[PDB]
Amino acid sequence: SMAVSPSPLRIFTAGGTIDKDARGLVVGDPFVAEVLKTARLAGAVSIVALSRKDSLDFTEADREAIGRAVGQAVEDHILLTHGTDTMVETARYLGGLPELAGKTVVLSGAMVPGRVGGSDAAFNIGFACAAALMLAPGVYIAMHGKVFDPAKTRKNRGLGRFEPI
Amino acid sequence: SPLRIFTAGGTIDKDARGLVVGDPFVAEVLKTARLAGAVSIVALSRKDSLDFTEADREAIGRAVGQAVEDHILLTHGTDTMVETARYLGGLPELAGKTVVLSGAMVPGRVGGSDAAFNIGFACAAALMLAPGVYIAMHGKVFDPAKTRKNRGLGRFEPI
Amino acid sequence: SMAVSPSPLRIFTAGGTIDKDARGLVVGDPFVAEVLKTARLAGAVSIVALSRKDSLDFTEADREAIGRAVGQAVEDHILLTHGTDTMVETARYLGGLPELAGKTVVLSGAMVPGRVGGSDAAFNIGFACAAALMLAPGVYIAMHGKVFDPAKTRKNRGLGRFEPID
Amino acid sequence: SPLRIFTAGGTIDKDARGLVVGDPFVAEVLKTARLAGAVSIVALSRKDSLDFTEADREAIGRAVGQAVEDHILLTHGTDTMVETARYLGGLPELAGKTVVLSGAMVPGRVGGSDAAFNIGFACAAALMLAPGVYIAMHGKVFDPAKTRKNRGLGRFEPI
């Protein structure tokens, strides 16, 4: 048969600074979809909205619903765009669900809204997409051009960066 | 792991300030990426890749061999990216390196460019893939020996 | 002599949505300076900072100070970038200063920060620069591709537009 | 006053597919300008202005004459903007209109372009200047009969 390009990555959007839209800022349409629109993909990426909340407003119940959506996807490569304030809490929660054992689940986002000049967003999305495809099964944070183990990571609010504990 | 980036020109770096090859766009993207790790950028060429000769490819291969880093990104034009990747794939000196070639179909300084996404994807690939030579474009990893540029499609494709 | 390009326009910056930047957004460096940097001007434009306040927070005293900077300029063509929330109050105040009688003074700004995609800012700066050069002496607001008389204008916060009192 | 905008191509409108002339950039700028007044945009040409003949200039003159509006902006390439402007300045049919020509030295779809600024400036000029034909570029108003394009300066300059 003629070659069929697969679509092995599914993306979930859960809000955050990456998606803030001043058109100060509040959470608008997912910025990840703008980046993939112009990525000239060989395949395609299904993109599904889970939430538009600021990550500091996430409850235990919000994390559980995200775990259930991730767990029910047919894809084994998952990228979750999210705010950076509670990305570590969501990542640690997902890491303790056995329903995710066979999946590579990467969380990412941006410190500068994608719709603001000089944003890290487009770089981070490309980096995180590749990380979701290439890393062994597990839950990871992809930021600053590297991979973080959620159990050994914290968000430094002052410096706007993830760092090792 | 420490990453070394080489720039050999191409559409990704075309500037209009038609277009012609300007300063490497990858340096603009990495500047706002807020990187944690060791990364350095080295300029090799501003040629349009259609003009690359066998001697240009051999010079690229020796330059990549000068890097002690084992994770390499080369930004390049798409017209002869496959020829450079296949040549590099046959150099025994590079056998322990992960070498990824990437670029852009639209200049990074033009609106709606794939460049920033491609640079992020390619940086991860150069850090995560096993030793070998790869093209990272269109959100996937190509094997150079089994890839061509399909000008009809506007994409790299498997042979 | 070899021709000398004049610099007949002076720009003052007083903050506003036009200048908001990520650090939500807050008032950063003047966006008007980024627009003029790439405008390939034949002349130049002297750009002076007066304030980084959100315009809601401007007092009687803030307006009086802006009136003094504008009045002491040598140039007779002046653009003031400003927040839109109290642009009408500033414009009305300047309109009552006899020291500005021979000057063309235009206020402008943006409803979307210049550093955000799909901003009105660069258009508004070009339109307002031309308005400051070409209108008769007076005080005006240049927004939405037109010229408003501050005495007959209000900001519609709800609608995001300047409009007449008709 | 109602403004009519004509697009005749030029660097301002060049897009990636080097660059070639694409959809009018003026329509992208006016879409986000939150305009209060009446403005309409009409496409005339996508030529590079070096290729315009005396017949092309005469066609542009009659198109401008078809507008009932008295305030006109024409976006154009800079290579023969002076030739078009001088030609229009000699048409008695246009004597009651304010006709402003503008464009950009960098395409509007390229980073660090003069285009958006030039469009705002030129729209104001078309609304505010006395009847006549003008070039609005570099934040000033040029008299076409006393203007040249100085490729050495990269600016229009007075004679």
Author numbering:
A (entry chain A): 0 to 22, 27 to 168
B (entry chain B), D (entry chain C): 6 to 22, 27 to 168
C (entry chain D): 0 to 22, 27 to 169
What does the paper say about this structure?
L‐Asparaginases (ASNases) catalyze the hydrolysis of L‐Asn to L‐Asp and ammonia. In contrast, the chain of ASNase from Rhodospirillum rubrum, reported here and referred to as RrA, consists of only 172 amino acid residues. RrA is homologous to the N‐terminal domain of typical bacterial class 1 ASNases and exhibits millimolar affinity for L‐Asn. Crystal structures of the wild‐type RrA, both with and without bound L‐Asp, as well as structures of several RrA mutants, reveal topologically unique tetramers.
Based on the previously published results for typical class 1 ASNases (Derst et al., 1994; Schalk et al., 2016), we tested two mutants, RrA(Y21A) and RrA(Y21F). RrA(Y21A) without added L‐Asp was disordered in the region of residues 22–26 and the active site contained a mostly disordered HEPES molecule contributed by the buffer. Solvent molecules occupied the space where the Tyr side chain is present in RrA(wt). In some cases, orthorhombic crystals with a doubled c axis were obtained, belonging to space group P212121. The a. u. for these crystals contained a complete tetramer. Although both were less active than RrA(wt), RrA(Y21F) is somewhat more active than RrA(Y21A), which is opposite to the results obtained for typical class 1 ASNases. While it is quite plausible that in RrA Tyr21 contributes to proton transfer from the primary nucleophile (Thr16), almost certainly its side chain also contributes to stabilization of the tetramer. In this role, substituting Tyr with Phe preserves this role better than the mutation Tyr → Ala.
